[PDB]
Design an enzyme around this catalytic site. Structure first.
Site, mmCIF file in Angstrom:
data_model
loop_
_atom_site.group_PDB
_atom_site.id
_atom_site.type_symbol
_atom_site.label_atom_id
_atom_site.label_comp_id
_atom_site.label_asym_id
_atom_site.label_seq_id
_atom_site.Cartn_x
_atom_site.Cartn_y
_atom_site.Cartn_z
ATOM 1 N N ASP A 35 -0.565 -8.785 3.682
ATOM 2 C CA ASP A 35 -0.276 -8.255 2.351
ATOM 3 C C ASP A 35 -1.554 -8.221 1.519
ATOM 4 O OD1 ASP A 35 0.750 -7.494 -0.045
ATOM 5 O OD2 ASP A 35 1.797 -9.401 -0.456
ATOM 6 N N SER A 199 -8.114 6.766 -7.625
ATOM 7 C CA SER A 199 -8.028 8.030 -6.922
ATOM 8 C C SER A 199 -8.453 9.167 -7.845
ATOM 9 C CB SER A 199 -6.600 8.227 -6.415
ATOM 10 O OG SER A 199 -6.387 9.530 -5.905
#
Length: 330
Positions: A35, A199
């Protein structure tokens, strides 16, 4: 040193991925959920409340000659999906794919919430976010990667998750045969303890690319892709009959649909998520309403590049003095 381990989807939907991890002496092998959105290595154990164990493999520290109680240490964690666990702490030897750390903090669960009990395939979590998020008190502990870093050939790990197929976590090296083209690296902020990056935009299907900054986290422990409501609405508007359902908890779409792809930007590069990766199947057994793999982050407080996005790429978690993330197509 290096390590290399195969990671395997837990079910036919890729709801999560499990990677075998050796703990203790002699080794006890548990299948952990790696994770990159958390920083605790915790396991089902001989200490877990018996009624909360239902098929998981447990770590028994009393059977490990290298286990040592970390005196006074406790841990307690709550995850974004509302699940939680807590307990006490041992140090022990932990190996992943041939890479060994001695003295790793192994957090032994005394209590786990129902969603953990109900998933017999996941024996615990191995956190790979920054150690500043580790919950052990009163002495915070380091992640497996942080402990291994100095010994690694290169201070990196990579995630290569499969679509409906096994993939690989590598530590200490970049497998140049595992991706196509080049790896595009992008800046990371560690201020929230996550692999947080920006992004450069998105496209839906064959549509034009929209240049827009989307700050979010690379999180292997989250199944879906969670993005701003504007972006998600633009995606689902291209699917006839798709709608946001408050009763189901997100966007659903007719199971008869063919989904468009979704592209996200990494610098000037582009990662394409095929439409099929966005199908999470019937909302309930036999339903013709299917659950979408791109969902709004509006109720989270952060955008999350979870498995839906990451499995479309070869992802480098660069733990150099100034961390960065790398993405390549594959």
């Amino acid at each position: 040193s290096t390590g290399s381990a195969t990671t395997t989807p837990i079910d036919s939907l890729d709801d999560a991925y499990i990677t075998p991890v050796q703990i203790g002496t002699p080794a006890q092998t548990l299948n952990l959920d790696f994770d990159t959105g958390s920083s605790d290595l915790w396991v089902f154990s001989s200490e877990t409340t018996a009624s909360e164990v239902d098929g998981q493999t447990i770590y028994t520290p009393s059977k490990s000659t290298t286990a040592k109680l970390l005196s006074g240490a406790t841990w307690s964690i709550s995850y974004g999906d509302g699940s939680s666990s807590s307990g006490d702490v041992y140090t022990d030897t932990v190996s992943v794919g041939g890479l060994t750390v001695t003295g790793q903090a192994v957090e032994s669960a005394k209590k786990v919430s129902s969603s953990f009990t109900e998933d017999s395939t996941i024996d615990g979590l191995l956190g790979l976010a920054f150690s500043t998020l580790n919950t052990v008190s009163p002495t915070q502990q380091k992640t497996f990667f942080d402990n291994a870093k100095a010994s690694l050939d290169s201070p990196v790990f990579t995630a290569d998750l499969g679509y409906h197929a096994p993939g690989t976590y590598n530590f200490g090296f970049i497998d140049t045969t595992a991706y196509t083209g080049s790896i595009t690296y992008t800046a990371v902020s560690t201020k929230q303890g996550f692999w947080e990056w920006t992004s450069t935009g998105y496209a839906v299907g064959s549509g034009t690319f929209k240049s827009t900054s989307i700050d979010g986290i690379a999180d292997t422990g989250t199944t879906l892709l969670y993005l701003p409501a504007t972006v998600v609405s633009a995606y689902w508007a291209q699917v006839s009959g798709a709608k946001s359902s408050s009763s189901v908890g997100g966007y659903v779409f007719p199971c008869s649909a063919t989904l468009p792809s979704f592209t996200f930007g990494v610098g000037s590069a582009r990662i394409v998520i095929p439409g099929d990766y966005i199908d999470f199947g019937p909302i309930s057994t036999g339903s013709s309403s299917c659950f979408g793999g791109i969902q709004s982050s509006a109720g989270i407080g952060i955008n999350i590049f979870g498995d839906v996005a990451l499995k479309a790429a070869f992802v480098v978690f660069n733990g150099a003095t100034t961390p960065t993330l790398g993405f390549a197509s594959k």
